[PDB]
Every structure is written in C-alpha cells, then in structure tokens.
Ligand binder design. Structure first.
Ligand SMILES: NC(=O)c1ccc[n+]([C@@H]2O[C@H](COP(=O)([O-])OP(=O)(O)OC[C@H]3O[C@@H](n4cnc5c(N)ncnc54)[C@H](OP(=O)(O)O)[C@@H]3O)[C@@H](O)[C@H]2O)c1
Ligand SMILES: NC(=O)c1ccc[n+]([C@@H]2O[C@H](COP(=O)([O-])OP(=O)(O)OC[C@H]3O[C@@H](n4cnc5c(N)ncnc54)[C@H](OP(=O)(O)O)[C@@H]3O)[C@@H](O)[C@H]2O)c1
Ligand SMILES: CC[C@@H]1C[C@@H]2C[C@@H]3[C@H]4C/C=C\C(=O)NCCC[C@@H]5NC(=O)/C(=C(O)/C=C/[C@@H]4C[C@H](O)[C@H]3[C@@H]2[C@H]1C)C5=O
Ligand SMILES: CC[C@@H]1C[C@@H]2C[C@@H]3[C@H]4C/C=C\C(=O)NCCC[C@@H]5NC(=O)/C(=C(O)/C=C/[C@@H]4C[C@H](O)[C@H]3[C@@H]2[C@H]1C)C5=O
Lengths: 354, 354
C-alpha cells in the first residue's frame, strides 16, 4: 500500500478575461496512491501544452483542482488489464501534474459549458518521431493543433488556386499551418498578427499580407485593412478571433465562400457578447459556416493520415511547424502567461518539458 | 410600328421598415412603343407575385422606376430573333406592369445591394399544368418558392428519421413546404405562425408544434417555448426570420445540426441589426450554416426534377401547395400590404391575377 510524492498546479481563484497565471495557480505537493485497479496506470508527465483554450477550462475547474491540459506521459506501473504497459508513451489530458493515476478511458467534462468528452489516451509510437519531428510534436503539429488545421483543410475547406484566404489569429500554430496549407493549395493568404516582428514572421511563412489587429481595432479600420489586403473579396475565412475582425470579413464574403469557426477569442477572453448580426450577410454569397470541434477527428485513421500528409511536408521542409519548449514543471504558468500579453518572442506551439 | 397604353406601378417614395404600400406606390398610364428590335418581345402580364423580399428590391429601385416582381407573361409579338414565339407563356421578373417590352435575356440588377443577375425568362408549358397544378403554380410550388424549399431539402439539408426540424416563418408557402418534406423524411417539425387559425392550419398539415411568435416577444420567451416544443434540441433549422427566434435556436443546436438561412425578416423589415454573437455557439455542435440564394438552382435540369418530384406529390394530394390569388391589377399593392399587416387571412402563396 505505497504512495509517492507528486507536485500539482491547482486553481486557486477564478478571474475572467486575460488570466494572471501568477494569481490563478498555486503549486502544491500531493501524496499519490500508487495502488492500481485492474486496468489503471501510474503515469509520469514528460511534456505539457499551454493553450489559450485553457482560460475557459480553468474558469470551469472547481477551485483547488488541478489544471487540466494536454500532455505526454510515460507509464511507470500498470494493472493486469491496463491498455498500455510500463514504458509506453501516451498523449492525453493529463493536466499540470508531475504524476497521476488514470485508466486512460474517455471521461466527461462534467462542469463544462457542454457535455464534452475528453478522449481516451493515445499510444505514441517512437517510429513516428525523429529530430525533424520530435516526440513533443504530439502536443502540436502531430497533436491536437495539427489535427485541427489538417482536418479543417481536408475535410471541410476546399481551397482552390486563385482564392483569397483570411486567417485571423494567424501567428499561432494552427493559424500558420492553415495559411501554409492554403498557400500550397494556391491561395492568396492574408493574416492578422500583433506586431511588426510577428507580421514579418508570417510574411516569412508565406503570408501574402498581414494586418496588425492592434492598430485596426474596430471593424471600420478593420474593413479598411481587409479591403486593401483582399481587394477581390474573401473566399475562405479561418476564424479564431471573432469580434470586429469577423464582422469585417463578413461584409466582403464572395460567392460560395466558406467560414471555419475554430475559436472566438474576442468573445471568450474579451467578453464581447453582442455585435452586428452576421447571418443577414450570407444569403447572396451562399456562404457555408461550419463550427470546428477537432475532437471528432481523433481516430486512428486520421492520426495516420496526419503523420503521412502533414508529417511528410514538415520533414521535406515544405512546411514550418515551430514550437517553443520551456523547461521546468515550475515554469508552467510562466509559459502559459506568455500566450496572453507576452506573445512577443512567442512562435508556434508553447510546451513545457518536465 | 405602333404604341399601346399600359399601366405601371412606380416607386414614388422610399419608406424604410414595414412598407406603407399606398404611400410608396403610384399607378400610372404609360404609352409603350411596340416597335420591336430583332430579339425583343411584347409581353402581357397574367399573374404577379407579391413577396416580402420585394421590400428590399423597392428600396433599391430609383424613384420613378417601375416596381420589379415575379410574373407569368404571354408573348403577344416577337422579333425574328426573339427567344420565344407569340402565344408562348413565360415566367420572369416582369414587374408590376400590365405590358412590357423585353428580350428575355438575363439582366444585371444594377442598383442592388449585391451584383445580382435576374434570370432569363423561362418558357412554361401548358401541358405541364392541370386543375391540380394550375398554371399559376409557376409563381409558387412550380416556381421560385417551390425551388427554394425543394432545393434546400435535397441539395443541403439531410433530414433523417428522428430529427427535430424547426422552421421560423412557417405559415407561408416556403415554410409549409419545408415542414411537409421534413415530415416525410421522419422528422418532428416545429414551426412558428402568427394566429391561432394558421397555427391550426399548419398542425392540420402535419406540424407537431407551432409556437406563436407574437406571444414570444423575446429570446427568453422563445427559448422556453422551443425547449418545450423541441426537448431533444434542434438538428435542422430553416430560418426566414432571424432576430430573437434565431438567437434562441442557436442556444440549443445539436451535434451535426444544419442551419439554412433563407431570410432575416427581423433585420430586413424590423431593422434589428444587433444581437448576441451567434458564431460562438456553433463550434462544439459542429453546426453547418448555409446562406440560401435559390437563383443558383434555376437550371433546366433542376426544373424538370422539381416538376417530377413535387408535381407528383402535389397532384396526388400528398403535398399541399395552397395559393391565395387576388384579382385585379389595381389591387397589387394592397395584396402586397397584407403580407405585413393582414396575413391572418392568407393561405400559401399570394398572387394577383391581372
Ligand atoms: N474548436 C477546436 O477544435 C479548436 C482546436 C484547437 C484550438 N482551438 C483554439 O483555437 C485557437 C487557435 O490555435 P493557435 O495555436 O493558432 O492559438 P494562438 O495563436 O497561440 O493564440 C494566441 C495568438 O493569437 C493572437 N491574438 C491574441 N489576441 C488576438 C486578438 N484579439 N486578435 C487577433 N489575434 C490575437 C496572438 O498573435 P501575436 O503573437 O501576433 O499577438 C497570439 O500569438 C486557440 O486559441 C485554441 O484555443 C480550437
Ligand atoms: N433566399 C432565397 O433564395 C429566398 C427565396 C425565396 C424566398 N425567400 C424568403 O423566404 C421567406 C419565405 O417565403 P414565403 O413565400 O413562405 O413567405 P411568407 O412566409 O408568406 O412571408 C410572410 C409571412 O411570414 C410571417 N411572419 C411575419 N413576421 C414574422 C415573424 N416576426 N416571425 C415569424 N413569421 C413571421 C407571416 O405569417 P403569419 O400569417 O403566420 O403571421 C406571413 O404570412 C420570405 O421572407 C421570402 O422573401 C428567400
Ligand atoms: C486530450 C486532447 C485535448 C482535449 C482538449 C479540450 C480542448 C477543447 C475544449 C476546451 C475548452 C472548452 O470547451 N471551454 C469551454 C467553452 C469555451 C469556448 N467555446 C467553445 O465552443 C470552445 C471550444 O470548442 C474549444 C475546444 C477545444 C479544442 C482542443 O483541441 C481541445 C483539447 C485537445 C487537444 C471554447 O473554448
Ligand atoms: C425571376 C425570378 C425571381 C427573381 C427575384 C429576385 C429575388 C432575390 C432578390 C430580392 C431582394 C434583394 O436582393 N434585396 C437586397 C438584399 C436584401 C436581403 N439580403 C439578401 O441576401 C436577400 C436575398 O437573398 C434575396 C433574395 C431574393 C430571392 C427571390 O426568390 C428572388 C426572385 C425570384 C423568384 C434579401 O432580401
């Protein structure tokens, strides 16, 4: 009847808007019972992801509980019917915890806005990873974010040569992957970034035009920047921002256009709940708008196609998937903070190697 | 060579909001030159359509111009290179005029909000019509509105047995037609209507619930009636109204739900331009939203299809395509006004026999 010392980051306090990592999260020591049920496993956390969607996960986490997050774990011990053996690497929602016990089965997010179901843990096979595509990429381009970009661009958006594609929130991993895929499919690609460096970075990834969303702060100034960046209209919009940039894009939708709603940062994070009605603007364009919830694509078939298609382009150097690996379980909230407010210096997926 | 006296309804004044049809329009005598260019035809108007979408056509029509509308016409006289011969019957955007000279070719709506192109005149064939499917159906179930409903239900929405289908604006020919096709695919069809007498007309047509949209002023009041009317949520939504009813339906979208946007009466007519941001409610449901602009389906193949699929069911009494034909050219604007003020007595498509 043993037990082990583990550390955990827990939700101290609920604060909406831009969260203040130093204030919401407290690092505690915790005794973990190492006694396993017949198909439970004891796991060690090797990497964790920090993502903006955690802001609204946290505001749904009971005070005192650990911060959920996507992670890479190694099995230390396992009961006789556990899905994985000791040594196996898994990707799943381990959280900001050094170690944990779980059977890796799918689990409801009880206190979520929706009845969301966190996926079963995914076995990672080392043959898929090398120095060009390290194991850590199971939290980025070979993970949720990659699956979001690749799934949208191959199961919904049909970018054609000549199209103008708008990507809001382009500086992040998903945005840059969508842009680079769109460019490969032959499109003019316009993005929004948040400073001259980031906008230059997107220009080095192949974006044809980059608009500063800090300068163009309202839909009118934003309408101006789009009309200059996209003079023939918008065929495809990959939206992570919402708000007044999305209001702007909807005024200039072309016929048969397609909008993918991946996130609404300006609503979720900036509490912008009311705005110009958008549906009156989509009838003549005959525009199709599809909500994106990439969990529906987490199948073994899609993960292989991901590693074939997307892993290939990354390895042949036809496609840049950049990540930023902060070291140290104790710097997890400092890494998370650098997503909001400190996006300067931040390229791609931010991970923490523990 | 020669001329003939005609009457025309012209736009004398622009009035926003709900139309004042007696203040907007003026009936004039107009001498038409009847000397025909080589592809021009002289046509005589048999029926005209009055529709809510005419409110926007009007506001885009220069003062003094004639009011455009959908009509059934008959070729009196035709140049040698005309597309049709005298005696031929055609459906086209002839307008509130007793006679006109046109060449039947597609025409750009110069002054539109959108660069829309009115279609070429479409020859009708009297063989195709009997007492069950009168010639006037070329302005209803065998015309515009019929092609809007049928096209949506066979080209976009995949209604499957067990769905809950919600139709805002259900009393008219389009909502009525959607519901009946949805019911034939196994759905539970919920609607809205404005009376008790139409509420009972829809139910008797096979609707399982009918909210009264006048009782339901609010997005709150509308959620409650919907929750009741559709307890398992919405999988399909045919929207003609927008506004607060649409804000309600978007709060209870099921997974893989489809929304088709037909009109936004609440914004177009009632001038409600702001509301809750709706896009942030579609991501988890993976809702698909498609603007409708049925002009895209006006193809020869699609008409023959519409005749055969619907003309069967309508004729065999399995599909109710009622119509309300007002008599008298001098009454066209009064018939148009009832769509907005006195619909309690209308049934299906409103036309005017000239
Ligand atoms: N529905 C789904 O299935 C799904 C799946 C995965 C992810 N998501 C969500 O979708 C988003 C996209 O992923 P990502 O990796 O591309 O995220 P991300 O870009 O890392 O999010 C932060 C970035 O967005 C930019 N940004 C911040 N505030 C902005 C604003 N108000 N207007 C415009 N841009 C702004 C910043 O660019 P600068 O650095 O240039 O300031 C920053 O680098 C994430 O927020 C994630 O939570 C949804
Ligand atoms: N996008 C396209 O391609 C396309 C093509 C054709 C038509 N449309 C539009 O689609 C709509 C449907 O066509 P239709 O022929 O069936 O017209 P309709 O529904 O007969 O239009 C007027 C009717 O709508 C109802 N109504 C008025 N205000 C309402 C409200 N606030 N909420 C709910 N219902 C309300 C009234 O019904 P009660 O008598 O029950 O009050 C009235 O009978 C029209 O708006 C039409 O212009 C679009
Ligand atoms: C173990 C795999 C992990 C599980 C994580 C759960 C993550 C998903 C859920 C994360 C947060 C959430 O659901 N917050 C409350 C709603 C706010 C807001 N409204 C939405 O509709 C929405 C999303 O729809 C997000 C989708 C994320 C997509 C992302 O890809 C998933 C992560 C995935 C990589 C929002 O954020
Ligand atoms: C000759 C065949 C005729 C040609 C007519 C032209 C009619 C179409 C045009 C009618 C009005 C219009 O274009 N008004 C300006 C936009 C306001 C508002 N925004 C929209 O996107 C919209 C429509 O999307 C309308 C679609 C109608 C659909 C209708 O069915 C067509 C008529 C059709 C039956 C709106 O109403």
């Amino acid at each position: 009847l043993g037990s082990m010392k583990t550390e955990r980051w827990v939700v101290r306090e609920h604060v909406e808007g831009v969260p203040d990592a130093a204030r919401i999260y407290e690092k505690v020591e915790t005794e973990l019972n190492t006694r396993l049920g017949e198909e439970q496993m004891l796991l060690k956390t090797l990497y964790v992801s920090v993502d903006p969607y955690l802001q609204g996960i946290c505001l749904d986490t009971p005070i005192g509980d650990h911060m959920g997050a996507d992670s890479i774990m190694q099995v230390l011990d396992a009961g006789p019917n556990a899905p994985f053996r000791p040594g196996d690497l898994v990707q799943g929602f381990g959280g900001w915890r050094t170690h944990l016990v779980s059977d890796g089965k799918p689990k409801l997010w009880q206190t979520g806005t929706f009845p969301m179901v966190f996926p079963a843990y995914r076995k990672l096979d080392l043959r898929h990873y090398d120095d060009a595509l390290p194991l850590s990429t199971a939290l980025g381009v070979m993970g949720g974010p990659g699956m979001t970009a690749w799934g949208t661009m191959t199961k919904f958006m049909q970018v054609r040569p000549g199209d103008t594609v708008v990507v809001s929130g382009a500086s992040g991993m998903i945005g840059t992957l969508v842009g680079q895929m769109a460019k490969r499919a032959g499109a003019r690609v316009v993005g929004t970034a948040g400073s001259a460096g980031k906008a230059r970075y997107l220009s080095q990834l192949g974006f044809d035009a980059v608009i500063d969303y800090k300068l163009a702060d309202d839909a009118d100034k934003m309408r101006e920047a789009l009309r200059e960046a996209a003079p023939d209209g918008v065929d495809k919009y990959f939206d992570s921002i919402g708000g007044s940039v999305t209001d702007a894009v909807f005024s200039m939708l072309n016929v048969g256009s397609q909008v993918a709603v991946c996130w609404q940062w300006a609503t979720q994070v900036q509490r912008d709940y009311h705005g110009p009605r958008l549906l009156p603007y989509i009838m003549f364009p005959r525009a199709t708008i599809r909500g994106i919830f990439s969990l529906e694509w987490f199948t073994e078939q899609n993960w292989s196609a991901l590693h074939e298609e997307l892993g290939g382009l990354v390895r042949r150097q036809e496609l840049v998937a950049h990540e930023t690996v902060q070291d140290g379980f104790e710097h997890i909230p400092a890494a998370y903070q650098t997503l909001f407010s400190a996006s300067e210096s931040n390229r791609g997926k931010v991970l923490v190697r523990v």
